[PDB]
């Protein structure tokens, strides 16, 4: 009944708990953690020209934390890609996000973070903007998906 | 370069301080002041299921204050209408928003607030949602416009 | 259901037969007739860089024909306005579109066509495009509305 | 300057000649040819409730033709997936579309068609509609991408 955006994904598995940051006006900063898989994931959005911090989707695992700072508004994502697969450290074979990689319209590449093991996924954007993330997190990132707008 | 919505209007005159709340996912509360014209105007938006207070656009004039509380998300605006006309007691005789009235999908009418003098305007929304307001305010609400999505 | 657009209006009365051209990529030509009111109203749309003729909504009345050819794609509408009121030679006081006027981003005004009698309506477009018309036609244009997209 | 949709992909290689059907209001029929790779690809779109013929992107190769007829409007795509890879029958190592598969909101799957060799791609759609295709076609289908709307 409230406003909606085109949403694609998720890529990954059905474990963890779903979260959805919803939609905003663009992306300023992406933060994540990684080792053999992706752990934490959080975003600072643009909301009508000011930063807005999304909720944190934190992993307690001892991973490396990274920060991707885009030159907003002139720089934005044109590609989200990665790999999904079971991870043998978990108690089950549920597929999780093993790797993530981002590319921008200014020709910068961020990543790959994690391990490129399993099934590649790739979302090239020819026209339009990522405006929001949604996903699934348990101990780590089980799945990821994107809201898009013009 | 950032995400955009359809913007219609403004209705009213050219004077006053320009403002633009930008766009959100819906409307929870509208607060305005009125007497001979509309004075203050501010909104508590929905942003992805949580309230978000927009900036206040307060008139310094001692007017009657009113709070319009919609049963969000099931109830939302289907019509924005009112009247614009010069406000004779300013030197510039500039047109301002003299009256506003709001109708909802649930058949509730809020208003008219102010005086029904001058040029009537009406935005009947058959499909889509109001997701943001913009305008101009000096001593009074000089003009108001609307962002739409869906 | 199928793809949708923001839809506003209609302005006018509930007489005549309803029609909806649906949505396209833009507006290339507006064809109308007029005298004391608007008679015929039909549109040549853009569809993906080629013209597409909307259904004809023609009046049999011996009115003056107008053909408005926009400089598509660089020139597009920024305002649709007009007047609605009853028309004395009908069996009921049902309101019809007495006048129309169109303005473009290049500064061109087309109109008024018809007679500026009754209640003024005005749709200023600050951001977005008209991508389709809907309306009601009997012997005259009883009502007119618009589909909008970014 | 004209109206626009979110465009994702293409998936495939840089060879062949660029084509773009543009956008419409939904999909009625997809017809393609296949054997070890995808040859022909063309679509009957919905445009405001009536069928619209897309341009044919046909291959001369002796492949099997198949017609995917959806129960439009109640049935629509919720996934487009396939495989892209070099093809040893060609005089270039450029990747091409080796296989395609479609799924609908009514639980039907069409495909896989062609050969599942190389790099999998997958566009799951949680919210929104495919409203158009674009791609590259030489002797066969080098690449495929999609236009989306709400």
Numbering used by the authors:
A (entry chain C), B (entry chain A), C (entry chain B), D (entry chain D): 1 to 150
Paper excerpt:
Here, we report heterologous expression and production of soluble biologically active FTP in E. coli and also describe the crystal structure of Apo-FTP plus changes on binding α-D-glucose or α-D-mannose. The FTP structure showed a β-prism I fold, which is found in Jacalin, Artocarpin and other lectins giving a high structural similarity; except for a few loop areas around residues Leu90, Glu36 and Lys106, some of which are flexible and adopt different conformations, even in the same protein. Like most-known plant lectins, FTP is a hololectin defined as a multisubunit protein containing several carbohydrate-binding sites to allow cell agglutination. In contrast, FTP binds carbohydrates such as mannose and/or glucose in a different way, paralleling CMB and also Artocarpin presumably reflecting the high sequence identities of 90 and 91%, respectively.
Crystals of recombinant Apo-FTP grew in space group P212121 and diffracted to 1.55 Å at Diamond Light Source. Molecular replacement confirmed four monomers in the asymmetric unit and refinement gave a final model with Rfactor: 0.163 and Rfree: 0.200. All four monomers are almost identical and their superposition by α carbon (Cα) atoms gave an RMSD of ∼0.15 Å. However, the loops around Leu90, which are close to the carbohydrate-binding site, adopt different conformations in different subunits. Analysis using the PDB and PISA server suggests that FTP could be a dimer or tetramer in solution with stable interfaces between any of the two relative monomers. A total of 970 water molecules and 20 glycerol molecules were built into the electron density, with one glycerol molecule bound in the carbohydrate-binding site. Interestingly, in our Apo-FTP structure, there is a glycerol molecule (GOL18–a constituent of the crystallization condition) bound at the carbohydrate-binding site, forming two HBs bonds with the carboxylic side chain of Asp142 and one HB mediated by a water molecule with the carboxylic side chain of Asp139. There are three cis-prolines in each monomer all of which fit the electron density well, consistent with homologous structures of FTP.
